[PDB]
């Protein structure tokens, strides 16, 4: 295991001055206007830049995977924001929830697998961590895979209302390829699993 | 090629009533409060649900891939929204831009590969299309891979300021595994490539 080099990005936090964050909205979550100047590639300083950034905490994401049965547990809940681009706003997702307090991502991954899927997790691994849409929100989501008994996954759970589904991994991945699953975190988790299932099954 | 079944999601748009979308903010883009009622799994109707949803159009995403050299072109630009969770807000990304007017995603993929990378694209394929963070924004991003001559990828391009990088695919994917690339669209494109490079190289 050899980590990679620092390169080829060299501009860091010493190359940016956040002039100010201007609160544009304060409800359940926030729109804030980042006002900033940054170094440019040609060595010159920038004009002041104004960026509207949706701010609303960060998420833990569990991929419930049963290594014995080679199955995944998906969850189903409505995402109203999906309405305008999707046939249905009910989406097939991974266990996930926002991180708060002194919670680690393991804390929240595990907590949410009970709240949303009634699922007790065994061994866990870190998968990947990703920024959802950096152009327009600071949200970071951190994904863990969790060893789960898929035979215990049933029922409705949860203003949250969630249904539980058990499919084989291969079916979960085909639904990615073919567009049935298409939320960022499921696609990332389920492509990650497809590149790793054999080594993971072997290890577990 | 056999598409999948309709199941197991059955609730559709006939099961939701958007009561109203209440504009909470109007600048470069919008925060709107979706007010809605929806069917619940146990057959009962919901209380009124209020969801704050960042609204700002949708994106096309190009993965510039050179099948001869087995290389990828990445771009580098600052994402200020990444500041709080990342060592550097300068990020290594895919060519991308917002969709407008009567633009198809091909139009925008191609347009942006010139604006951001000076790149002329040859053959294109659809990869995947995904919702960035459905919990908190309606943004959909649609990814195409594009046959590109990596030897023509150089320089600064672009309030946009973008640098261009040519790495081998394997290096691009290792940077995903190890966390150097971690924006949703790059991770999805670059895991997709890793599952498909051989068939794509063979076809092209």
Swiss-Prot record, chains A, B:
Q: Which GO terms describe its molecular function?
A: ADP-ribose diphosphatase activity; ADP-sugar diphosphatase activity; magnesium ion binding; protein homodimerization activity; pyrophosphatase activity
Q: Which EC class is this protein assigned?
A: hydrolase
Cofactor note, please?
A: Binds 3 Mg(2+) ions per subunit.
Sites binding substrate sit at 28-29, 51-52, 56, 79, 98, 133-135, 139
Q: Which reaction does it catalyse?
A: ADP-D-ribose + H2O = D-ribose 5-phosphate + AMP + 2 H(+)
Some GO term, biological process aspect, for this entry: which one? response to heat
Q: Does the keyword Hydrolase apply?
A: yes
Activity regulation field: Inhibited by phosphorylated compounds such as AMP, ADP, ATP, 3-phosphoglyceric acid and PPi. Not inhibited by orthophosphate. Activity is high in cells grown in low glucose concentrations and decreases dramatically as glucose concentration increases.
- Gene3D superfamilies on file: Nucleoside Triphosphate Pyrophosphohydrolase
Where, by residue number, does Mg(2+) 3 bind?
A: 112, 116, 160
- List required co-factors: Mg(2+)
- In Swiss-Prot or TrEMBL terms, this protein is called ADP-ribose pyrophosphatase
State the organism named in the record.
Answer: Escherichia coli (strain K12)
Provide the gene name from the record.
nudF
């Amino acid at each position: 295991s050899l980590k990679p080099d620092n390169l080829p990005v060299t501009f860091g936090k010493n190359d940016v001055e956040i002039i100010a964050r201007e609160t544009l909205y304060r409800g359940f979550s926030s729109l804030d206007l980042y006002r900033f100047r940054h170094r440019l590639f040609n060595g010159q300083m920038s004009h002041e830049v104004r960026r509207e950034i949706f701010e609303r905490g960060h998420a833990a994401v569990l991929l419930p995977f049963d290594p014995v049965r080679d199955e995944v547990v998906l969850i189903e809940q409505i995402r109203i924001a999906a309405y305008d681009t999707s046939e249905t706003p009910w989406l097939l997702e991974m266990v996930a929830g926002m991180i708060e307090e002194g919670e680690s991502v393991e804390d929240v991954a595990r907590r949410e697998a009970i709240e949303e899927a009634g699922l007790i997790v065994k061994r866990t691994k870190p998968v990947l961590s990703f920024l959802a849409s950096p152009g327009g929100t600071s949200e970071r989501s951190s994904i863990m895979v969790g060893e789960v008994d898929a035979t215990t996954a049933s029922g409705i759970h949860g203003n949250e209302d969630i249904r539980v589904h058990v499919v084989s991994r291969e079916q979960a991945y085909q639904w990615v390829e073919e567009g049935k699953i298409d939320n960022a975190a499921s696609v990332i988790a389920l492509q990650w699993l497809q590149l790793h299932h054999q080594a993971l099954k072997n290890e577990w």
